[PDB]
């Protein structure tokens with residue numbers, strides 16, 4: 001309920017560092033990583049996994065989880081560490097595809113100064129998030145919850161909406177506890 005948390009700094013010699021860095025560096029090799037931190041919020045983690053369980057019973061053969069990037073301002077880090085991507089933080093996200101939290105497949109998307117806004121020290125922030133993309137469709141700005149999969153059973157909704165169903169670039173999650181901010185990357189130009 002209180003959703004307290006811990007910030008563990010990974011040594012660059014830690015395997016975990018090599019993995020997160022490896023993925024980041026697919027599109028952001030010209031940037032300079034200063035630290036990667038793991039975020040441990042047991043309440044949030046339990047909450048996240050609770051949803052993952054009920055989604056893994058519904059979507060049959062679908063791989064519901066993805067690891068996607070999300071940039072934000074220095075001044076949002078404590079709110080996200082504690083609360084995740086709850087409903088108040090979606091008021092500060094684009095509406096082009098709906099009113100939820102936006103997650104990019106590639107780290108260069110998030111590495112934009114609109115999203116990973118450089119701080120007073122010129123340091124930029126991008127989370128490497130676990131997100132339940134599940135079953136998804138094309139999106140639009142007017143949405144506040146995802147569209148109905150079945151018009152004949154419209155209380156069963158899509159999990160997320162994307163820019164492009166067959167070749168996605170970003171994903172929009174609308175529900176609380178549908179993403180876990182596992183890793184935080186800190187870097188400069």
Ligand SMILES: O=c1[nH]c(CS[C@H]2CC[C@H](O)CC2)nc2cc(OCC3CC3)cc(F)c12
Nearest residue numbers: 070071072073092094096102104109110115
């Ligand atoms: O990484 C992202 N972070 C974010 C959060 S921005 C953050 C900036 C400081 C503010 O206080 C909180 C909100 N939004 C995004 C949106 C995206 O798509 C928006 C266009 C398709 C319409 C793609 C992205 F990669 C991202």
